[PDB]
mmCIF file of N, CA and C in Angstrom:
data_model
loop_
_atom_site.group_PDB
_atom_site.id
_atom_site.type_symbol
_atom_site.label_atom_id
_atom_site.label_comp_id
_atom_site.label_asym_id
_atom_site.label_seq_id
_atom_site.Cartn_x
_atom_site.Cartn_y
_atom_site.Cartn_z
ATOM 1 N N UNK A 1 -107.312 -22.793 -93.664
ATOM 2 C CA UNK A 1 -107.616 -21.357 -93.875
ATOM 3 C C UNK A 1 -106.808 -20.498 -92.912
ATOM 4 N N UNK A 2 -106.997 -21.206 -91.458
ATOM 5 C CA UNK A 2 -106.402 -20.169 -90.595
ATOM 6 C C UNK A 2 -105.687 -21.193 -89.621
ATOM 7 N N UNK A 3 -104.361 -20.737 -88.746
ATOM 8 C CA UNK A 3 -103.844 -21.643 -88.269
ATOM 9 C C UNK A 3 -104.634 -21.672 -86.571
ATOM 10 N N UNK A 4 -105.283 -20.410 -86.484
ATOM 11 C CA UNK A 4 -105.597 -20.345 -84.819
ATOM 12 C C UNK A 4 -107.572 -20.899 -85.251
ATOM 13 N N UNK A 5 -107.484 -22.070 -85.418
ATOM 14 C CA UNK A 5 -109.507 -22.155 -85.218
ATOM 15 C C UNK A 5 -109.654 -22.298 -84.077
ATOM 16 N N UNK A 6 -110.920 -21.966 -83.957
ATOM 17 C CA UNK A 6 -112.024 -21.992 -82.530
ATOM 18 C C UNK A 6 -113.174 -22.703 -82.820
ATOM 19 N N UNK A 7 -113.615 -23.897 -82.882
ATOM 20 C CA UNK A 7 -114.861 -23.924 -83.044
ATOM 21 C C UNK A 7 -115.091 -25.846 -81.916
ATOM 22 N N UNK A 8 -116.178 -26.211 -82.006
ATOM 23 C CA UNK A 8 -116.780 -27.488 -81.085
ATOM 24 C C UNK A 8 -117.360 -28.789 -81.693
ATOM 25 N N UNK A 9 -116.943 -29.895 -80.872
ATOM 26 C CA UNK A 9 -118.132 -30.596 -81.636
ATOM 27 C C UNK A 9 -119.170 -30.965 -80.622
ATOM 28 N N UNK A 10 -120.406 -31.763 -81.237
ATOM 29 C CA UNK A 10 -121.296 -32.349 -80.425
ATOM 30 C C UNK A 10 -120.545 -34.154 -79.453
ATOM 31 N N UNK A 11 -120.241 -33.788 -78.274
ATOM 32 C CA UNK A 11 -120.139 -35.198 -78.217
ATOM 33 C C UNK A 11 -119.134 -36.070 -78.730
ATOM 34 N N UNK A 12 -119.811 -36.908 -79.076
ATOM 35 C CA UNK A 12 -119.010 -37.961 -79.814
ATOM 36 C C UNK A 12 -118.715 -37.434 -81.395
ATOM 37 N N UNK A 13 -119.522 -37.115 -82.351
ATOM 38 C CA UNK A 13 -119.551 -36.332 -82.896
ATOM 39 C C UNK A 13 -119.819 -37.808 -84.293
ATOM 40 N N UNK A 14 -121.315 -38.245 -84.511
ATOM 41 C CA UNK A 14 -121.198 -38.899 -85.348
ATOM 42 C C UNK A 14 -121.881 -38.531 -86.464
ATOM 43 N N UNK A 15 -122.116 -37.095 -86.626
ATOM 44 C CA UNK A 15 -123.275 -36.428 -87.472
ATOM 45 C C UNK A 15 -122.131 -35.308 -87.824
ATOM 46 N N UNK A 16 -120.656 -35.874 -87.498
ATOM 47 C CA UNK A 16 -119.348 -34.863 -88.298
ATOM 48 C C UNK A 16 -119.287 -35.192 -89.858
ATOM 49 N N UNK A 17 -119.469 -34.076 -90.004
ATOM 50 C CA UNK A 17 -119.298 -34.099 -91.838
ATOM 51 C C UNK A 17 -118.199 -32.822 -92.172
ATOM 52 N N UNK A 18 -117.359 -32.533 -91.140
ATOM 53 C CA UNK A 18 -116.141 -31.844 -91.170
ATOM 54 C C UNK A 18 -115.115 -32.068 -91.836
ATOM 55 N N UNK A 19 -114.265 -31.482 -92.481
ATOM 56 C CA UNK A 19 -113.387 -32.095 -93.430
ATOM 57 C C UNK A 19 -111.706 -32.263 -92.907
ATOM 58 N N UNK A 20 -111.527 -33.366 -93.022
ATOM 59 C CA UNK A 20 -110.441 -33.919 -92.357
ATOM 60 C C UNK A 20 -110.120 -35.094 -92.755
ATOM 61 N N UNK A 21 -108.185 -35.386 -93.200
ATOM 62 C CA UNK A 21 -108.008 -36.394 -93.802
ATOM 63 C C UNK A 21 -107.070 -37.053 -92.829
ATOM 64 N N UNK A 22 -107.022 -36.355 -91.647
ATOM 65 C CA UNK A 22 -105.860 -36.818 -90.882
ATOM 66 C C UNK A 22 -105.861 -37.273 -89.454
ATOM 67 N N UNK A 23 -105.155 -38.511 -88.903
ATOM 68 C CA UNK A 23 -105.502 -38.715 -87.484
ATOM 69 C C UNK A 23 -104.986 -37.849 -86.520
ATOM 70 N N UNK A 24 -105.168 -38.547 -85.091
ATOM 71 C CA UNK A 24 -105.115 -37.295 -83.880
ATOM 72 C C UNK A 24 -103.182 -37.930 -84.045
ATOM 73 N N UNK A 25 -102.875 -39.041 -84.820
ATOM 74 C CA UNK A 25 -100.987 -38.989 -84.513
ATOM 75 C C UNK A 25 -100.794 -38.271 -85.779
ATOM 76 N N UNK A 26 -101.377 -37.360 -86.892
ATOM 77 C CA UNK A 26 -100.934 -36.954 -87.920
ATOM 78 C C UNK A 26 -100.849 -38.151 -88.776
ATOM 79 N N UNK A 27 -101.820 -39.185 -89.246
ATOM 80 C CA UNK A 27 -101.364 -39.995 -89.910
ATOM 81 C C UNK A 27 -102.310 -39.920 -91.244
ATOM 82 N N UNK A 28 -102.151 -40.381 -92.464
ATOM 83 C CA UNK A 28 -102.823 -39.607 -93.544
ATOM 84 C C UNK A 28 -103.834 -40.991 -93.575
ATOM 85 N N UNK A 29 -105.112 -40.256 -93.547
ATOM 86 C CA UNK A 29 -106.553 -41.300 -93.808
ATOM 87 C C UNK A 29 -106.047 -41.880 -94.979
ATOM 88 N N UNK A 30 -106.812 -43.373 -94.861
ATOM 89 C CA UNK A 30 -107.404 -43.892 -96.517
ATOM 90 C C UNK A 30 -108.614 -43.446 -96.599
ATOM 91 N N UNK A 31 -109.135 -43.537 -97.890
ATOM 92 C CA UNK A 31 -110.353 -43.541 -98.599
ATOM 93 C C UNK A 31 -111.280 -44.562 -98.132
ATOM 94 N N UNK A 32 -112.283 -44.324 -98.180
ATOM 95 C CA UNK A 32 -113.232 -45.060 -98.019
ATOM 96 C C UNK A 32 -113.617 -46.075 -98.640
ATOM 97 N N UNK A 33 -113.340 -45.545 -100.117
ATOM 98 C CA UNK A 33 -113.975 -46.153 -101.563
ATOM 99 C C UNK A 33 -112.440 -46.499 -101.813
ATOM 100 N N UNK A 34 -111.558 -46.455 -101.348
ATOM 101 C CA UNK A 34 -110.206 -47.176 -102.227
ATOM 102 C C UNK A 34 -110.410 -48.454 -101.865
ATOM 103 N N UNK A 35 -108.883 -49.347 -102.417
ATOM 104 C CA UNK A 35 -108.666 -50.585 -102.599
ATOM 105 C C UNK A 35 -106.986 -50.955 -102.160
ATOM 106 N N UNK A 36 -106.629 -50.256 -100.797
ATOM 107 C CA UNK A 36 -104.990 -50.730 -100.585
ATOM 108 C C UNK A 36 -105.324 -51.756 -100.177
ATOM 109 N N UNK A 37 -104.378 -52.735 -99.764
ATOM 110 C CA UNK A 37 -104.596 -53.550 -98.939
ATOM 111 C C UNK A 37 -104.562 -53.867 -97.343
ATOM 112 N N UNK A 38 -105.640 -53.929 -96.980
ATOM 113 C CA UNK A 38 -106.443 -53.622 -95.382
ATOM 114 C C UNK A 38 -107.883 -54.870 -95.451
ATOM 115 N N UNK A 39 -107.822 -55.112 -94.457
ATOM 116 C CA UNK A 39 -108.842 -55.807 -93.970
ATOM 117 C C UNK A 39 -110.116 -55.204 -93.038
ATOM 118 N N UNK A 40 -111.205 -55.036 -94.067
ATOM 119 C CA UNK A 40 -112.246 -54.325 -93.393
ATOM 120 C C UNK A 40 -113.638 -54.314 -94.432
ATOM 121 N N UNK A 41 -115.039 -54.417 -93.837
ATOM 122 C CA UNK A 41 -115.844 -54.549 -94.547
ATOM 123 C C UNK A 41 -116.634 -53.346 -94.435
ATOM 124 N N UNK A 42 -116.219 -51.707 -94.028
ATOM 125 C CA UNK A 42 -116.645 -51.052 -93.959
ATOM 126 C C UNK A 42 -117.194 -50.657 -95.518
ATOM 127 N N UNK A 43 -117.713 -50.688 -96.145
ATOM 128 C CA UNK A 43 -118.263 -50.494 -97.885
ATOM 129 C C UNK A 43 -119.198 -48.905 -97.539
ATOM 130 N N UNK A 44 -118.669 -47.807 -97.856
ATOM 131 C CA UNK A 44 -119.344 -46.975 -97.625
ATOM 132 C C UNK A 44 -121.094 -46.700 -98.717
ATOM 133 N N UNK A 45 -121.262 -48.046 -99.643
ATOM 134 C CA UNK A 45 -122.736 -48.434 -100.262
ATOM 135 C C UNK A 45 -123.291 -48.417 -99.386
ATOM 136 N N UNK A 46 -122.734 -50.050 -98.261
ATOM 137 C CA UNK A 46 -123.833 -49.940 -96.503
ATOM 138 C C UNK A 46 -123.979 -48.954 -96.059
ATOM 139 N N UNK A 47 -123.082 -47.776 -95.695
ATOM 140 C CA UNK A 47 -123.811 -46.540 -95.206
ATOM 141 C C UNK A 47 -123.902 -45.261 -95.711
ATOM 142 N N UNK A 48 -124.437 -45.497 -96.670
ATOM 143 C CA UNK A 48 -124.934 -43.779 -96.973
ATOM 144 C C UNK A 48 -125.304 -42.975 -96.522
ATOM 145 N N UNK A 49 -125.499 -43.466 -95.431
ATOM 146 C CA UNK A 49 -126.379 -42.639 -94.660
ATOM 147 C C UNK A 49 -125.431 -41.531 -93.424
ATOM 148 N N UNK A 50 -124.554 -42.036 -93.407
ATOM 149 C CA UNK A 50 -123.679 -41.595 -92.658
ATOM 150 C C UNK A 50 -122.611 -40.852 -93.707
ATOM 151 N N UNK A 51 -122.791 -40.830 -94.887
ATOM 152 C CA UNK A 51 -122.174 -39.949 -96.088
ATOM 153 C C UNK A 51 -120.799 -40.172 -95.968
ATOM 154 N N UNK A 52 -120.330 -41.644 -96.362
ATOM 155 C CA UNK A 52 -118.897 -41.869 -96.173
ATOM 156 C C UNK A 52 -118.152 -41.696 -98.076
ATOM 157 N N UNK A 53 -117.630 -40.626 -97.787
ATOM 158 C CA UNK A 53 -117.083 -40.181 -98.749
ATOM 159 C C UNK A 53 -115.800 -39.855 -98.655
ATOM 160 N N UNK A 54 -114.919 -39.876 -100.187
ATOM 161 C CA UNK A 54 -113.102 -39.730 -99.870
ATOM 162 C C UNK A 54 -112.237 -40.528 -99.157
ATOM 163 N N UNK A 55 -111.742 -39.168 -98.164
ATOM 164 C CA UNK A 55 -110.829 -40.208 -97.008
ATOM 165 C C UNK A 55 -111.464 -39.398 -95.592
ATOM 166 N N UNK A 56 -112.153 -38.632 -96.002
ATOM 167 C CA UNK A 56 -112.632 -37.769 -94.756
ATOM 168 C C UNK A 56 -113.319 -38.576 -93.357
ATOM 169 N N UNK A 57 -112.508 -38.401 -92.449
ATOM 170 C CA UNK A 57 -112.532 -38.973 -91.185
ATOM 171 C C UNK A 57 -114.294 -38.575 -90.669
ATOM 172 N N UNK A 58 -114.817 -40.335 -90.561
ATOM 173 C CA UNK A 58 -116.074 -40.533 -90.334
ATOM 174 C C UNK A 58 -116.098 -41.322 -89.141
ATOM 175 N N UNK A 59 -117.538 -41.338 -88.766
ATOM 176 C CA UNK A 59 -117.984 -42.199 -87.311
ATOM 177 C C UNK A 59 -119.500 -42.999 -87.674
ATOM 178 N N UNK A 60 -119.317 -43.987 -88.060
ATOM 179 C CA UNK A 60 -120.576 -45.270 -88.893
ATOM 180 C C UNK A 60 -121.079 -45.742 -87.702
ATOM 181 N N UNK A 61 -120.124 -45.808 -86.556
ATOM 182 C CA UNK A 61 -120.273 -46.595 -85.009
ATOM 183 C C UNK A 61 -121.113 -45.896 -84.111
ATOM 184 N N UNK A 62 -120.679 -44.419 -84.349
ATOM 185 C CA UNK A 62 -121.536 -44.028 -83.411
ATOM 186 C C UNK A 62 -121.083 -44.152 -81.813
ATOM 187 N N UNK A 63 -119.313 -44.391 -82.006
ATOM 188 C CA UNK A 63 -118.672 -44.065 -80.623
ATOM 189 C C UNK A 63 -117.921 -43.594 -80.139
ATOM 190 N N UNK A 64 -116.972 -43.585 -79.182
ATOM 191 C CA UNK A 64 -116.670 -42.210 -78.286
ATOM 192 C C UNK A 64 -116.492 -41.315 -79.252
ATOM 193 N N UNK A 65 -115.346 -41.343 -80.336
ATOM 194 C CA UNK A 65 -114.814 -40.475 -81.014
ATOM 195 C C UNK A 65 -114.662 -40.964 -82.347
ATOM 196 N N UNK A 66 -114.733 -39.992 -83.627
ATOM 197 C CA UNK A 66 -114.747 -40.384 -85.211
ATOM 198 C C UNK A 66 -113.038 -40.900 -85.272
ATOM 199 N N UNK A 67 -113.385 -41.930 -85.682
ATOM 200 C CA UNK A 67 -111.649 -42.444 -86.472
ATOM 201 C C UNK A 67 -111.676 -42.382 -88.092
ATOM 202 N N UNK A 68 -110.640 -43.447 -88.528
ATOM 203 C CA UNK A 68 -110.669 -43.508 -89.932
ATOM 204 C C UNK A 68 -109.242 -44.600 -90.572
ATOM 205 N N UNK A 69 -108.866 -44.855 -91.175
ATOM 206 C CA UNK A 69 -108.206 -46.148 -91.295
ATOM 207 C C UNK A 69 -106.929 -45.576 -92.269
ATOM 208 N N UNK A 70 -105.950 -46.027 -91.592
ATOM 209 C CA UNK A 70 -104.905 -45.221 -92.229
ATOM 210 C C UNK A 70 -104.066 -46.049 -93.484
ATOM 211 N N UNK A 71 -103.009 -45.184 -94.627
ATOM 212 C CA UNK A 71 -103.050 -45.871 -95.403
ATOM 213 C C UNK A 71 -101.560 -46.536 -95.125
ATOM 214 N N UNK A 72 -101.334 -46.783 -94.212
ATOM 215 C CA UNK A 72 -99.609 -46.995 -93.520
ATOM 216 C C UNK A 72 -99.802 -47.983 -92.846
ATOM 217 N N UNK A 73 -99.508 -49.453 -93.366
ATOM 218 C CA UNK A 73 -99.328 -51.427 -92.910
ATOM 219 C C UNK A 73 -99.098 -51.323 -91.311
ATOM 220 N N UNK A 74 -98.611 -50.305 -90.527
ATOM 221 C CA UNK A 74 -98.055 -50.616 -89.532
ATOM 222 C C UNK A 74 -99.873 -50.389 -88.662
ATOM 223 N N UNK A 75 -100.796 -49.711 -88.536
ATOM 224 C CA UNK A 75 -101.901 -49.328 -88.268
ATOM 225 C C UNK A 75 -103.386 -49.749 -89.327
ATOM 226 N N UNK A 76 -103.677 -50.135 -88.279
ATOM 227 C CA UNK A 76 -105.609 -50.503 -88.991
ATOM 228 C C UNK A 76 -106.446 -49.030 -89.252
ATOM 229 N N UNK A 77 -106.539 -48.920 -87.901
ATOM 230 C CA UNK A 77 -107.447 -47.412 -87.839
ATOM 231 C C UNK A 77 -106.666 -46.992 -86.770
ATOM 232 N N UNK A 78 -107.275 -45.253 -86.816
ATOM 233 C CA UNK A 78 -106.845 -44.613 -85.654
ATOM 234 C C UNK A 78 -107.905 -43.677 -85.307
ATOM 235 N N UNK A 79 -107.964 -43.214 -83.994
ATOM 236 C CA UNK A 79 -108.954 -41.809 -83.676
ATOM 237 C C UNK A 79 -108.705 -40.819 -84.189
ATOM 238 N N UNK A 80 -109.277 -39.948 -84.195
ATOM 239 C CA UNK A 80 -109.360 -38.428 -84.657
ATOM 240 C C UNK A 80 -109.287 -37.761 -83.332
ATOM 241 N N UNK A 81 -108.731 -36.646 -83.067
ATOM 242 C CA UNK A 81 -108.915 -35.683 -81.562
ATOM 243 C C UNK A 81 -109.613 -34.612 -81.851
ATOM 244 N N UNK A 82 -110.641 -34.406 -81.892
ATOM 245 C CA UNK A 82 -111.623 -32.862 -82.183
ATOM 246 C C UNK A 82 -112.080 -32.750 -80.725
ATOM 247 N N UNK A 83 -111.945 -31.132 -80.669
ATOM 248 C CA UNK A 83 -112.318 -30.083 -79.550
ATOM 249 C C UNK A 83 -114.219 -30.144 -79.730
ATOM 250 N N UNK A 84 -114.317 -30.720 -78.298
ATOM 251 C CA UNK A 84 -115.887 -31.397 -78.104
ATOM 252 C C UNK A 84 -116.224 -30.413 -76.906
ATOM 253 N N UNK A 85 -117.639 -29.554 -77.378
ATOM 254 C CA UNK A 85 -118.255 -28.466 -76.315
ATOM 255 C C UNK A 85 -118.022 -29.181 -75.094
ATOM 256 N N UNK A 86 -118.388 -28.167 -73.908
ATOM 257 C CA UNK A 86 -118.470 -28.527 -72.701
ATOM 258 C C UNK A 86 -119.474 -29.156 -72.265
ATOM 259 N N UNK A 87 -120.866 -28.708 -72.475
ATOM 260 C CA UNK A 87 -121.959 -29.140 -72.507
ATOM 261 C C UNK A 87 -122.434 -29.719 -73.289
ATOM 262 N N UNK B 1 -100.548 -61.867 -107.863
ATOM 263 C CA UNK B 1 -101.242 -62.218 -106.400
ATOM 264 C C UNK B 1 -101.888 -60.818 -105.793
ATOM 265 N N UNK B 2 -102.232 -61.839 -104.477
ATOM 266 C CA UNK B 2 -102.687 -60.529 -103.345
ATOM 267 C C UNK B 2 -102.136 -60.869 -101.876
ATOM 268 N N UNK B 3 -102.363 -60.432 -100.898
ATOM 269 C CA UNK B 3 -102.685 -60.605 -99.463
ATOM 270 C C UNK B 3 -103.218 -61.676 -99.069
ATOM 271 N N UNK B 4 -102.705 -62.896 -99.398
ATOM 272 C CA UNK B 4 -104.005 -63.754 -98.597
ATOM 273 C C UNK B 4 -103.533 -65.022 -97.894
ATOM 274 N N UNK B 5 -102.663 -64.329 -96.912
ATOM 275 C CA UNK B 5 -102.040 -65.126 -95.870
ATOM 276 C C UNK B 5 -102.626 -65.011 -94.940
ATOM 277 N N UNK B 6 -103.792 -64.761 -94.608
ATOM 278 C CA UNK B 6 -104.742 -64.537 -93.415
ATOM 279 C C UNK B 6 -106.005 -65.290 -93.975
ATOM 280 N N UNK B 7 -105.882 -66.094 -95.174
ATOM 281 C CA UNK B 7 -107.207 -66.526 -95.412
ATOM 282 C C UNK B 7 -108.196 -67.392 -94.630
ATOM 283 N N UNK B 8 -108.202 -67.874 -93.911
ATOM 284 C CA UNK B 8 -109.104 -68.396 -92.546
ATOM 285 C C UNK B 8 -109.439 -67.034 -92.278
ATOM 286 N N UNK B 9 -108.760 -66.061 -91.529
ATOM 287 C CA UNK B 9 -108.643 -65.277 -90.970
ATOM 288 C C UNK B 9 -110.054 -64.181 -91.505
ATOM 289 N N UNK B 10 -110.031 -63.695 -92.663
ATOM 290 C CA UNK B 10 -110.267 -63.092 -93.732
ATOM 291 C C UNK B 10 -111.964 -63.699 -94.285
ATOM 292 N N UNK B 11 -111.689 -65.032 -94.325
ATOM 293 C CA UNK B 11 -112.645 -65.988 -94.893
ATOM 294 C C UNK B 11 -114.238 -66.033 -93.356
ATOM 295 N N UNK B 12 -113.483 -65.846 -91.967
ATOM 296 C CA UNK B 12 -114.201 -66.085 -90.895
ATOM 297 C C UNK B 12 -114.991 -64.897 -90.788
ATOM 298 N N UNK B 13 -113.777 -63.749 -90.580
ATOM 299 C CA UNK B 13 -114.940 -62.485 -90.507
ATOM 300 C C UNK B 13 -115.483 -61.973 -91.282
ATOM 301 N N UNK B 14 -115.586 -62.597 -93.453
ATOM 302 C CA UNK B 14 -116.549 -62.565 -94.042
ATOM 303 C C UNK B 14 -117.629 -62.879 -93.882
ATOM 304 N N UNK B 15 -117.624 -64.222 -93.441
ATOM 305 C CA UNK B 15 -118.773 -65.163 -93.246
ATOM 306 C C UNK B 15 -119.424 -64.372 -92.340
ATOM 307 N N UNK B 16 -119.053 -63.808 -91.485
ATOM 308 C CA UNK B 16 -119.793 -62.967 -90.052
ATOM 309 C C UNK B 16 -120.288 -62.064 -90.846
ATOM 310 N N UNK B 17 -119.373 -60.833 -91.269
ATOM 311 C CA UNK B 17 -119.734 -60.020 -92.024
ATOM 312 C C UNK B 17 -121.434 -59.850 -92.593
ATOM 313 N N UNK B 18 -121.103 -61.172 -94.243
ATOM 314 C CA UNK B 18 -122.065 -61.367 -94.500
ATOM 315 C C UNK B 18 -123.393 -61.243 -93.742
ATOM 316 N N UNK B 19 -123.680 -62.801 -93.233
ATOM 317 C CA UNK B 19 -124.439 -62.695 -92.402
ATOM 318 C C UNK B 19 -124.706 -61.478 -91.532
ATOM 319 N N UNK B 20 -124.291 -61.391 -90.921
ATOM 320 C CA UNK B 20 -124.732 -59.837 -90.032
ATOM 321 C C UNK B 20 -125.500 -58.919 -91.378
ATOM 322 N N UNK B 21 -124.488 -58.747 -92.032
ATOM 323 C CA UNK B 21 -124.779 -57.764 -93.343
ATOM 324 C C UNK B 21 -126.574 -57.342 -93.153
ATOM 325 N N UNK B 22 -127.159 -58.674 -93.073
ATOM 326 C CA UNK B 22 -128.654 -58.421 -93.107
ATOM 327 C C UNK B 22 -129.159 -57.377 -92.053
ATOM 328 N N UNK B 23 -129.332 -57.603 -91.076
ATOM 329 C CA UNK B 23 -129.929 -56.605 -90.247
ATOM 330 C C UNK B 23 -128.706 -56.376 -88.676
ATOM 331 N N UNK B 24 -128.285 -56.875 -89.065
ATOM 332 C CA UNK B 24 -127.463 -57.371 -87.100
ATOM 333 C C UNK B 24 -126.031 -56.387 -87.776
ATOM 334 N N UNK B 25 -126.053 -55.234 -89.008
ATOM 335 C CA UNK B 25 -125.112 -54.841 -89.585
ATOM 336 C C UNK B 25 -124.248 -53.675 -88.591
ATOM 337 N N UNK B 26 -125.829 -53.154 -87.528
ATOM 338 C CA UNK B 26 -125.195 -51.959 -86.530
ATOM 339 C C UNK B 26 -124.029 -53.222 -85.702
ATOM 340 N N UNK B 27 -124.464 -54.041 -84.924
ATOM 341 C CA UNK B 27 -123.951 -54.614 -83.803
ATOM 342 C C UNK B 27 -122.430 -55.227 -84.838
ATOM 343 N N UNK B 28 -122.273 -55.209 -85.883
ATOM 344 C CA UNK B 28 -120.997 -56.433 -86.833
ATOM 345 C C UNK B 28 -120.354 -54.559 -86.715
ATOM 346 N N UNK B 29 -120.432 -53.866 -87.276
ATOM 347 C CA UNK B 29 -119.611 -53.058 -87.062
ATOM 348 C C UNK B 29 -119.009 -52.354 -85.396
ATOM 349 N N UNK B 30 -119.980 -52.547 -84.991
ATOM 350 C CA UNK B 30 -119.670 -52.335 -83.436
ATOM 351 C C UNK B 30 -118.544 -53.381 -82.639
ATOM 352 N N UNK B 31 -118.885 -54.497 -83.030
ATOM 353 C CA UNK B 31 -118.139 -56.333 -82.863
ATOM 354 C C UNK B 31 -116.531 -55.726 -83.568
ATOM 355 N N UNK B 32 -116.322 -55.551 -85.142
ATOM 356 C CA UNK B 32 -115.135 -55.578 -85.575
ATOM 357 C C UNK B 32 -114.501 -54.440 -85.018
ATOM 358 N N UNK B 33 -115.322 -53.249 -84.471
ATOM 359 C CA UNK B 33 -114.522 -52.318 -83.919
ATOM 360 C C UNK B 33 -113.773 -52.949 -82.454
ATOM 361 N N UNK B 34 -114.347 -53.565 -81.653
ATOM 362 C CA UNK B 34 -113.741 -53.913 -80.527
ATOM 363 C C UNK B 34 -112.957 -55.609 -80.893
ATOM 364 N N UNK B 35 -113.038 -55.678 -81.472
ATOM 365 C CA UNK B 35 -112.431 -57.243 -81.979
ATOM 366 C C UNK B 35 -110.763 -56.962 -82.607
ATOM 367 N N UNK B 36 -111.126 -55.826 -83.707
ATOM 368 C CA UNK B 36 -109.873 -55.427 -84.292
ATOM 369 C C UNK B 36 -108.450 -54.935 -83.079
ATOM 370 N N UNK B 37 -109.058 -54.132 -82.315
ATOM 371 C CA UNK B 37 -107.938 -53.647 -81.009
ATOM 372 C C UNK B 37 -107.675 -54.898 -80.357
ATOM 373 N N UNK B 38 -108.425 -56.179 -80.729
ATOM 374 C CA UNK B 38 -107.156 -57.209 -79.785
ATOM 375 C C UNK B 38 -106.565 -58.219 -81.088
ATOM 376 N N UNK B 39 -106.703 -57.694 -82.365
ATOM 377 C CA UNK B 39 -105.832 -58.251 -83.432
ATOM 378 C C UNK B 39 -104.687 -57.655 -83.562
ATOM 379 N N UNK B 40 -104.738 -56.182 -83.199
ATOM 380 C CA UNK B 40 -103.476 -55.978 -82.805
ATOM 381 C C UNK B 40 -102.643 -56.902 -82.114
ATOM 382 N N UNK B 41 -103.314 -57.173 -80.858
ATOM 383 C CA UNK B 41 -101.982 -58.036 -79.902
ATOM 384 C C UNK B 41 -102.210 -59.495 -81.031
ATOM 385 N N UNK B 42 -102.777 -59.527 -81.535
ATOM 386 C CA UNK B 42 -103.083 -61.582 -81.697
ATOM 387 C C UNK B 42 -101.924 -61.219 -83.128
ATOM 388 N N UNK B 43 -102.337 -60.343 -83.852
ATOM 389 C CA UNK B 43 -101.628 -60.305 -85.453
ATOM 390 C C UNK B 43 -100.023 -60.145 -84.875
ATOM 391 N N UNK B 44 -100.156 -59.195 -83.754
ATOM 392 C CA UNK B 44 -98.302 -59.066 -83.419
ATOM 393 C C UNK B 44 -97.599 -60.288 -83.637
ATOM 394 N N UNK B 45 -98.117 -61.497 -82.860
ATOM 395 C CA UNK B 45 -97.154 -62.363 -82.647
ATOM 396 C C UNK B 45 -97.072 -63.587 -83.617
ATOM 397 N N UNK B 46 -98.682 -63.582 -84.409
ATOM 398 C CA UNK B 46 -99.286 -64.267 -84.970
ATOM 399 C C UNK B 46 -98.248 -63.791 -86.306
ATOM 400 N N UNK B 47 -98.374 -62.709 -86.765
ATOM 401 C CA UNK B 47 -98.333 -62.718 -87.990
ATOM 402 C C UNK B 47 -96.209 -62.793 -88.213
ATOM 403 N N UNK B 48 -95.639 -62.202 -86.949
ATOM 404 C CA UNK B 48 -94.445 -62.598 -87.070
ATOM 405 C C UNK B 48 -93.872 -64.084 -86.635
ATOM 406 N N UNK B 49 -94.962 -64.295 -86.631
ATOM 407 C CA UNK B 49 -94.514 -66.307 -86.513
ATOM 408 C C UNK B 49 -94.574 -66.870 -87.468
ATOM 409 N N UNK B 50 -95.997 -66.910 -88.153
ATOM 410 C CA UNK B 50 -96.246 -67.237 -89.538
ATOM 411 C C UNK B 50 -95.508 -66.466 -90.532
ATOM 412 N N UNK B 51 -94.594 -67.450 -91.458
ATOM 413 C CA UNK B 51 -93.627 -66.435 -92.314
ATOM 414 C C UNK B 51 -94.512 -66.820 -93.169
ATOM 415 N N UNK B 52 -95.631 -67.740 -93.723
ATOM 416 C CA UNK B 52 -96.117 -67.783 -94.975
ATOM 417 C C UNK B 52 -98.331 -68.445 -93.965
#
């Protein structure tokens, strides 16, 4: 929308339902629900609960920071970098 | 075909998978998250050794 945002997250931030397809190196998410070839049993059925949908960069773990699994052989997953309040 | 030059590989952390799957599913995702960052180093050398 705008190139200058301002806004925070909580923490670690595993209750992000922010929309974002991309890592903190610029690298383009996979899907959750796709089928490239990657090794991982993340099945976003197991967590619904954590609303893993698309390719939108999620946190199922619940640690330091939300990653997401990229669709480029050279990388598994990567972090996300979101601006986390002070407090 | 597919990918399945890692099948041990593939076949081991199903079996975990699975199992965990039942209730131990928080701690198996927590496990492959810190397991995967040293497949990096193991797949580096591993997987350019193994040509098949």
């Amino acid at each position: 929308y705008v190139e200058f945002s301002e806004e925070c997250m909580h923490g670690s931030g595993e209750n992000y339902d922010g929309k974002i397809s991309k890592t903190m190196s610029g690298l383009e998410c996979q899907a959750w629900d796709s089928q490239s070839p990657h090794a991982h049993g993340y099945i976003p059925s197991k967590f619904p609960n954590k609303n893993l949908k698309k390719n939108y960069c999620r946190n199922p773990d619940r640690d330091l920071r939300p990653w997401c699994f990229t669709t480029d052989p050279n990388k598994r997953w990567e972090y996300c970098d979101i601006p986390r309040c002070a407090a | 075909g597919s990918v399945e030059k890692l099948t041990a590989d593939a076949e081991l952390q199903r079996l975990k998978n699975e199992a965990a799957e039942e209730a131990e599913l928080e701690r198996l995702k927590s496990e492959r998250h810190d397991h995967d960052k040293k497949e990096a180093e193991r797949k580096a050398l591993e997987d350019k050794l193994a040509d098949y």
